Design a protein around this ligand. Structure first.
Ligand SMILES: O=C1Nc2ccccc2/C1=C\c1ccc2c(c1C(=O)O)OCO2
Ligand SMILES: O=C1Nc2ccccc2/C1=C\c1ccc2c(c1C(=O)O)OCO2
Ligand SMILES: [Cl-]
Lengths: 148, 148
């Protein structure tokens, strides 16, 4: 069911990890900076996400997070169906790749306006979600239509 | 209006829980911080505004209202910063009631997580999903209607 499908994505910058959740149908993103990708961090990030949007299905970003008992516990707790992120439609490798590139571009464009990477990442999330409908507008419409 | 949010700060286990309430829906976002600073408040508002169309924020106290860092974040994110003075006195009480409710939910989940921040996100989840529509459903409908 389209409105509740999200994809996890992990990318690297400045020796740190940027963990991303993409709402597949809209292109809307949430992101956080962490020292490294662990089951613990991934579990906590999904809990945050699911308290904020109606997350039904998550395509995990790799097999370690798919396997993680802590990630499984969070998915059970929050009512999320955990799936693999295997691009059976191969335009997912590329589409995610393109987003990471775009995200990194925006980060570079704002980088000097903040001391800490996490701040620049949130600025980039803001710009990405507001860019013109915007991704922010699309996700709200998709989910509102699903409630109605 | 669809873009009006209220900041709220409450205390638990020697820590601070920073809360943003979408006034029209009762939908909340929250984070745990060691103490309320302009810096933390600014970062929290940036995160919020990248995720929802935040037009106006009623700040929780005069220190955050005055903070140059909070003002910088509000300027950056296009947020009109206002005071949170309850000219309608059913705001003191309504916010107070939410903190009580939040703390109740936190206590109900507290033993399921080691760290307070996890329990707080569980409580956000439960609060936003509680049904008759949930706060999560209401915020999406309000904002979707505003776009259309
Ligand atoms: O046992 C649990 N069940 C869960 C269900 C949902 C989300 C986390 C958990 C968790 C534990 C948990 C997971 C990730 C964390 C974390 C904790 C914790 O014990 O505080 O602290 C920060 O990152
Ligand atoms: O100069 C700025 N302009 C802003 C506009 C929006 C949000 C933050 C800022 C900020 C600075 C800033 C504010 C709060 C932070 C923070 C930073 C930072 O320098 O990285 O790191 C964590 O918490
Ligand atoms: Cl929700």
């Amino acid at each position: 069911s389209s409105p509740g499908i999200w994809q996890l994505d992990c990318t690297h910058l400045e020796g740190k990890v940027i963990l991303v959740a993409v709402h597949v149908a809209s292109g809307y993103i949430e992101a956080e900076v962490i020292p490294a990708e662990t089951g613990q961090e991934t579990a906590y990030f999904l809990l945050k996400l699911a308290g904020r949007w109606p997350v039904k299905t998550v395509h995990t970003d790799n097999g370690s997070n798919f396997t993680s008992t802590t990630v499984k516990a969070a998915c059970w707790w929050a009512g999320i169906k955990q799936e693999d992120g295997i691009p059976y439609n191969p335009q997912s490798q590329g589409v995610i790749e393109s987003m990471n590139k775009e995200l990194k571009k925006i980060i570079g464009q704002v980088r000097d306006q903040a001391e800490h990477l996490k701040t620049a990442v949130q600025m980039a999330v803001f710009i990405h979600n507001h860019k013109r409908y915007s991704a922010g507008e699309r996700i709200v419409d998709i989910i509102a239509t699903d409630i109605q």
